[model samples]
Target: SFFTAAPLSYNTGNSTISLDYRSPQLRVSGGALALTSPVFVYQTPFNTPMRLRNGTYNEYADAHIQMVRFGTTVLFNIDVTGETNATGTQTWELQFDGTLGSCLTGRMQVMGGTGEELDVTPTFILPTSDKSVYKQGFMPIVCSENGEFKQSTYCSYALTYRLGNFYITLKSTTSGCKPIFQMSFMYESQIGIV
Candidate 1:
């Protein structure tokens, strides 16, 4: 093993929720990653993953908008029950897009009349077969399309702490697309290669 300055230790505690759909969100001690209730949205990517996970039958469009919001925390779960192309798999993700009215309580306006406020991108992907709970964080680098191709795109970034155990783990890559403004989407994780 390679020697290091100190031994790595990851022992984050379970986060307490203020509101939940399956259970009540009671206050607790220590720290926890706050989460919102599962919101249903349809994306072509979700179509296959949903079925493989054996979720209740529900038809969704190839391109749709749906998300859940958590108070205090600007975090949301995107299309947890959506379908994926993979066989017998359920995918979830911590997502961030320029559309704030749908996922957040902020004003969103399209820049340069492009009809797009921000380029849609994935912060992370988590997959599950039994619809397990999980969480992950991402860096939302916001930028102006005019300068996105050449300059920095990060603006107003926030810290995300994972809450909960028994996770399946989600992975993500930094986006190359440009944005209209600089902002960190703070993408949260849910479940897959999605």
Candidate 2:
């Protein structure tokens, strides 16, 4: 074994959610101020991972997004569940991209696959009359499209201590694609390939 500065330890928890519909827009997007919501709201324990894993679902498209205080990195795989051939690969970038909507495509599949983040819980909007609020801490992973890509699909997916008290909310900017998302805030800690 290669010696290191310190012994490595990874015991990240796991959490996952399967989102299949778009809820009412609780907030508005930037510039055009488009309505956005059905935000998948969830709470996490004090411990979780920050890395997003690679998926192997080779269909039309199969990807997941996460939100945090610093990032809006959206990892996607194209036409994953469709009937056509997804030419080659894919990509994503929120905070920017108004036309293509930041989706550079690519890849998952599983046999009963499923996170502390994995061990986390899910929340949603009810018939209550309270207008929703995006807590200052959690990043909103919005998988949405506007401008030229407005007609296309996406909601996207985040963190901290003293902050697990506040919930993490996810938003798919547009109302086009309702994805089956397997989420995680847990990391893989193996000596080699994790």
Give the number of the best model, judged by lDDT.
1
lDDT of 1 by residue, 1-194 (tens): 33223233333355322332233333322454323332222122223322222224242212122222222222322222222222222222223222121222122221222323434232222222233433344434322243334334222222222342122222221244322222223233333211
Can you write out model 2's per-residue Cα lDDT over 45-115, one digit (the tens) per residue?
22321222123434333333332211122122211122222322222212211221121121111111122
Candidate 2 residue 132 C-alpha distance from true site, Å: 21
The TM-scores of all predictions, comma-separated, are 0.18, 0.17
Model 2, CA-based lDDT: 0.24
Which portions of model 1 show Cα errors greater than 4 Å? 1-126, 140-142, 147-194
Q: How much is 104 displaced in model 2, in angstroms?
A: 35
Residue-pair clashes per candidate: 23, 40
